[PDB]
Amino acid sequence: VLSPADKTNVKAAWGKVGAHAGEYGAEALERMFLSFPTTKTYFPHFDLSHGSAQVKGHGKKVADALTNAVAHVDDMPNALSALSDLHAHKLRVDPVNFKLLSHCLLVTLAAHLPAEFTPAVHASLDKFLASVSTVLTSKYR
Amino acid sequence: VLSPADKTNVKAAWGKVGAHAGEYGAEALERMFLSFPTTKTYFPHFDLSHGSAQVKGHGKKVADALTNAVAHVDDMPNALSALSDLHAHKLRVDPVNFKLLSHCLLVTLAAHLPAEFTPAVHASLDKFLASVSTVLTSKYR
Amino acid sequence: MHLTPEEKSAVTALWGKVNVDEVGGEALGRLLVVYPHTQRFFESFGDLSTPDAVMGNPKVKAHGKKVLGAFSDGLAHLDNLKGTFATLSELHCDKLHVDPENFRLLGNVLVCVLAHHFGKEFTPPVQAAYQKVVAGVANALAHKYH
Amino acid sequence: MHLTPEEKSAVTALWGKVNVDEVGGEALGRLLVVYPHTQRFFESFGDLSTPDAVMGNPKVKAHGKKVLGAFSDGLAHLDNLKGTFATLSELHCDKLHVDPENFRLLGNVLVCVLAHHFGKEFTPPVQAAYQKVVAGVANALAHKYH
Ligand code: HEM
Ligand code: HEM
Ligand code: HEM
Numbered sequence: 001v002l003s004p005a006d007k008t009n010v011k012a013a014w015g016k017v018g019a020h021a022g023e024y025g026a027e028a029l030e031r032m033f034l035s036f037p038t039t040k041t042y043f044p045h046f047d048l049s050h051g052s053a054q055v056k057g058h059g060k061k062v063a064d065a066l067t068n069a070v071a072h073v074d075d076m077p078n079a080l081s082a083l084s085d086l087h088a089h090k091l092r093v094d095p096v097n098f099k100l101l102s103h104c105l106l107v108t109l110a111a112h113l114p115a116e117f118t119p120a121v122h123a124s125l126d127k128f129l130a131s132v133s134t135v136l137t138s139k140y141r
Numbered sequence: 142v143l144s145p146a147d148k149t150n151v152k153a154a155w156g157k158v159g160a161h162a163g164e165y166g167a168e169a170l171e172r173m174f175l176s177f178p179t180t181k182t183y184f185p186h187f188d189l190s191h192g193s194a195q196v197k198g199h200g201k202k203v204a205d206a207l208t209n210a211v212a213h214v215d216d217m218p219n220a221l222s223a224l225s226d227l228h229a230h231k232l233r234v235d236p237v238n239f240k241l242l243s244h245c246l247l248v249t250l251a252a253h254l255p256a257e258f259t260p261a262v263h264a265s266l267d268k269f270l271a272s273v274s275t276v277l278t279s280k281y282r
Numbered sequence: 283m284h285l286t287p288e289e290k291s292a293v294t295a296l297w298g299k300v301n302v303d304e305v306g307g308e309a310l311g312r313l314l315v316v317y318p319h320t321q322r323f324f325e326s327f328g329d330l331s332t333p334d335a336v337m338g339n340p341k342v343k344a345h346g347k348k349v350l351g352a353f354s355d356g357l358a359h360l361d362n363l364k365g366t367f368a369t370l371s372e373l374h375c376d377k378l379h380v381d382p383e384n385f386r387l388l389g390n391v392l393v394c395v396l397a398h399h400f401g402k403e404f405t406p407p408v409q410a411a412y413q414k415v416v417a418g419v420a421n422a423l424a425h426k427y428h
Numbered sequence: 429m430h431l432t433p434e435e436k437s438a439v440t441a442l443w444g445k446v447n448v449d450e451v452g453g454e455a456l457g458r459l460l461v462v463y464p465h466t467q468r469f470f471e472s473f474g475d476l477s478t479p480d481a482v483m484g485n486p487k488v489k490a491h492g493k494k495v496l497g498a499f500s501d502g503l504a505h506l507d508n509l510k511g512t513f514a515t516l517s518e519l520h521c522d523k524l525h526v527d528p529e530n531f532r533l534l535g536n537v538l539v540c541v542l543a544h545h546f547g548k549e550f551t552p553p554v555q556a557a558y559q560k561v562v563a564g565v566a567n568a569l570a571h572k573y574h
C-alpha cells in the first residue's frame with residue numbers, strides 16, 4: 001500500500017531521475033543480466049552484449065513505463081493493465097524475476113542519485129517497485 | 142482470481158476433509174517442520190517433537206481458520222483479517238514460509254484423498270491456498 | 283548434498299516401487315495443469331485446453347517418461363548430481379531458455395504426485411528426503427545457466 | 429561459490445576502500461528502515477521509531493560495525509564461508525531465531541549501500557561479484573540451521 005508519504009518521495013526521487021530514466025533503465029537492465037544470469041532466458045532474441053542497442057532501447061521502454069506509474073500512482077492497476085497482460089499471460093515471467101529487476105533498479109538509482117536516495121527514499125522506492133511488480137504479476141491467475 | 146469452478150472444488154474437497162481437518166492440519170505443520178527446518182524459527186516456544194500435543198492443537202487452529210476461509214470464499218480479505226495482522230504484524234512471517242506450508246497442505250491432502258485430488262482439484266487448491274496466503278501476507282509493508 | 287544414509291536409503295527405497303512410465307506422465311501432466319504458464323514450452327504437444335486434454339495427451343505421457351527417466355538416472359547418482367545433469371543443464375538453458383525457477387515447480391509437483399500414489403507411506407521423514415532430492419535435482423539442472 | 433579470480437580480485441580491491449564504521453551503520457540502518465519487521469529483532473536496541481532515529485542510534489551503528497566486521501572475515505576466507513560462519517550460524521538459529529530469509533535482505537540492502545557509496549565506481553561487473561559474495565554469505569549463515 002502506497003502511503004501519501006511514499007508517493008511524495010517517489011515523485012521526488014523519480015523527478016530527480018528526470019531525463020535520465022532510460023539511461024537508468026538500460027543500466028539497471030544490464031546490471032540484471034550480469035548479476036542474475038537466469039533472467040536472460042526471457043530475452044533470447046536479444047543482443048545482450050555490453051551497452052547494446054536492444055538493451056539500450058528496452059531500458060527506455062522500461063523506464064518510460066515506470067514513469068507512467070509514478071504519474072499514475074494513486075491508480076496503478078488501470079494505468080498498467082496492458083503491461084499486466086503482456087507480462088503475466090503472454091510473456092509469462094516468473095515473479096522472482098521482478099524482485100531482481102527492482103533490486104537492480106535500486107542499485108542503479110542508488111548509485112546516480114547519491115543525495116536523494118536517503119533511507120526513507122530507499123524505503124519508499126522499494127514499496128513502489130514491489131507494487132508495480134504485483135500489479136504486473138497479478139493476473140497470473 | 143478464484144473462479145466459480147475453482148470454488149466449487151475447494152468446497153467439495155474441503156468437505157471430504159471433514160473432521161480429519163485438524164489432524165490434517167497437524168500433519169501438515171509436521172511435514173513442514175520436518176522438511177523446512179527454517180520454518181521452526183517461528184515456533185521457538187513449541188514442543189516441536191514428533192507426536193507433540195502443542196502441535197495437534199495448532200494444526201487444529203489452522204485447519205479451522207482454513208474452514209472459515211472456505212465458508213467466506215467471497216470475502217476472504219475480511220473474513221480472515223484478524224489473522225492477517227497476526228501474521229503480518231505481530232508474528233512477522235516472511236512469505237516463502239507460506240508457500241512451504243501450502244506445499245505441505247497439498248501433500249497431506251494428496252495422501253489422504255487419493256480420488257478427490259484429481260488434477261483440476263489440485264489446480265484449485267494451490268490457488269485457493271495461494272489466495273489465503275496473499276491475504277495473510279499483505280500487511281507486511 | 284546433505285543426504286544421510288537413512289535418507290538416501292529411504293529415498294532409494296521408495297523409488298523401486300515406482301511405476302516410472304505412469305508416474306512421469308502424472309507429473310509433467312499435473313505441472314501443465316496446475317501451473318499453466320509452463321505450457322508455453324510445449325506448443326508442439328498439440329491440445330492443452332482442458333485438464334483431460336493434458337493428462338490424456340500421449341505426447342505429454344511420453345515426454346513425462348523421459349523426464350522421470352533422467353530423474354531416475356540421477357537417483358542412481360546422488361553424489362554426483364551436477365555432472366549427471368551437466369549436459370541436460372546446458373540444453374535446458376542454451377537451447378530452450380527455461381527459467382530455472384520452473385524446476386522447483388516440477389520438483390514439488392513431483393513430491394505431490396508421489397504423495398498421491400503411496401498415501402500414508404509417504405510419511406513426513408520420507409517427504410523430507412524427497413525434498414532434499416528434488417531440491418538437488420533443481421540446483422543441478424540450474425547449475426550451468428550462464 | 430564459483431568465484432573467478434577476476435571477481436575475487438574485484439571484490440577484494442573494493443573492500444579495501446570501505447569505511448567500515450560508515451557502511452556498517454548505514455546497511456544495518458537501511459535494513460531496519462526498509463524492512464521494519466527486522467526491527468523486532470533488536471527491540472532491545474532502543475528507539476527505532478523514525479528514520480533519523482534508527483540511522484542515529486549508537487547501538488545500531490555499533491552492531492553495524494560488528495556485522496560488517498564479520499563480512500570481512502568472509503572475504504578473507506571465501507573458499508571456506510561455511511567453516512568461517514559456522515558459529516555465527518547456530519547463534520542466529522539457536523539463540524536468536526532469525527528466519528534465514530532475512531539474510532538475503534541484508535546482503536541486498538548492503539549491496540544497495542556500497543553502491544550508494546562508490547557511485548559510478550560500482551560498475552555492473554563488480555556488482556555481479558558482490559552478488560555472488562553476499563549470496564555465499566547468506567547461505568553460509570543458513571547452513572547450520574536444523
Ligand atoms: C518494473 C518491472 C517491469 C516493468 C515496469 C516492465 C515493463 C515492460 C515494458 C514497458 C515492456 C514493453 C512492451 C511494449 O512495448 O508494449 C516490457 C517488455 C518485456 N519485459 Fe518487462 N517490465 C518489467 C519487468 C520485467 C522483467 C522482470 C522481465 C523478466 C525478467 C521482463 C521481461 C520482459 C520481456 C521479455 C519483454 C518483451 C521484450 C520484447 O519482446 O521485445 N520485464 N516490459
Ligand atoms: C494458510 C496458512 C496459515 C494459516 C491458515 C494460519 C493460521 C493461524 C491461526 C488461526 C493462528 C492463531 C489464531 C489464535 O489466536 O488462536 C496462527 C498463529 C500462528 N501462526 Fe499461522 N497460519 C498459517 C501459516 C503460518 C505460517 C507460514 C507460519 C510461519 C511459518 C505461521 C506461524 C504462526 C505462529 C508462530 C502463530 C502463533 C502461535 C503461538 O505462538 O501460539 N502460520 N496461524
Ligand atoms: C526434473 C526437472 C527436469 C528434468 C529432469 C528434465 C528433463 C528433460 C529431458 C530429459 C528432456 C529431453 C532432452 C532432449 O530433449 O534432448 C527435456 C527436454 C525438454 N525439457 Fe526438461 N526437464 C525438467 C524440467 C523441465 C521443465 C520445467 C521444463 C519447462 C517447464 C522443461 C522443458 C523442456 C523442453 C521444452 C524440452 C524439449 C521438448 C521437446 O523435445 O519437444 N524441462 N527435459
Ligand code: HEM
Pocket residue numbers: 466469470491494495498499516520524526530531534535565566569
Ligand atoms: C549474513 C548477514 C548477517 C551477518 C553476517 C550477521 C552478523 C551478526 C554478528 C557478527 C553478530 C554478533 C554478536 C556476537 O558475536 O555475540 C550478530 C548478532 C545478531 N544478529 Fe546477525 N548478522 C546477519 C544478519 C542478521 C539479520 C538478517 C538479523 C535479523 C534481523 C540478525 C539479527 C541478529 C541479532 C538480533 C543479533 C544480536 C543483537 C544483540 O542482542 O547483541 N542478523 N549478527
